[PDB]
Swiss-Prot record:
The modification Phosphothreonine is found at T92. It catalyses: [protein]-peptidylproline (omega=180) = [protein]-peptidylproline (omega=0). It comes from Homo sapiens (Human). Changing W120A: 200-fold decrease of sensitivity to CsA. Reduced ability to stimulate MAPK/ERK phosphorylation. Its main location: cytoplasm. The modification N6-acetyllysine is found at K27, K43, K75, K81, K124, K130, K132. Changing W120F: 75-fold decrease of sensitivity to CsA. Changing H125A: Loss of peptidyl-prolyl cis-trans isomerase activity and interaction with HCV NS5A. Loss of ability to stimulate MAPK/ERK phosphorylation. The gene is PPIA. This is Peptidyl-prolyl cis-trans isomerase A. There is a cross-link at K27, K81 (Glycyl lysine isopeptide (Lys-Gly) (interchain with G-Cter in SUMO2)).
Length: 164
């Protein structure tokens, strides 16, 4: 019953591969629905064509800024920012999908895929999904990151949508 969304990743325009996510609509419905709708683009805006602007190997891949492409923009389907829904789910290892924010109740559209256990984020960032297929593609994305987060090539969501 939980939706599945996919990202087809590209590296400097070359296809890399496909990652799919399960979204925990059963536990964080508002958060999950924001990510789902931005992945289908059904509201007229969303993730298609946007980049992963910050990749720190051994920590996380961050993306979702589809308005300024650098970590300063983005927006939710509900408006500029919406509340922390709940902190039921924790950052328990690689493949966790969690919201980026700039303080309490400042979720927009930026998210990150964890590539490590990041338990110090528990209770501060809403966990809402997990990689289902293509963790190996996330691992490949990590090789284009750097210690300060700048990537050596442009990582883009070439296509994205809902699989079920």
């Amino acid at each position: 019953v939980n939706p599945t969304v996919f990202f087809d990743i590209a590296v400097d325009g070359e296809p890399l591969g496909r990652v799919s996510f399960e979204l925990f609509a059963d536990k964080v419905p508002k958060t999950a629905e924001n990510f789902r709708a931005l992945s289908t683009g059904e509201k007229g805006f969303g993730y298609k064509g946007s980049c992963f602007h910050r990749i720190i190997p051994g920590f996380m891949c961050q993306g979702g800024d589809f308005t300024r492409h650098n970590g300063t923009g983005g927006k939710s389907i509900y408006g500029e920012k919406f509340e922390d829904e709940n902190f039921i789910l924790k950052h328990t290892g690689p493949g966790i999908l969690s919201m980026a924010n700039a303080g309490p109740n400042t979720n927009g559209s930026q998210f990150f895929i964890c590539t490590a256990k990041t338990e110090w984020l528990d209770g501060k960032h809403v966990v809402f999904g997990k990689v289902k297929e293509g963790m190996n593609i996330v691992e490949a994305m990590e090789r284009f990151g750097s210690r300060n987060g700048k990537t050596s090539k442009k990582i883009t969501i070439a296509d994205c949508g809902q699989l079920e």
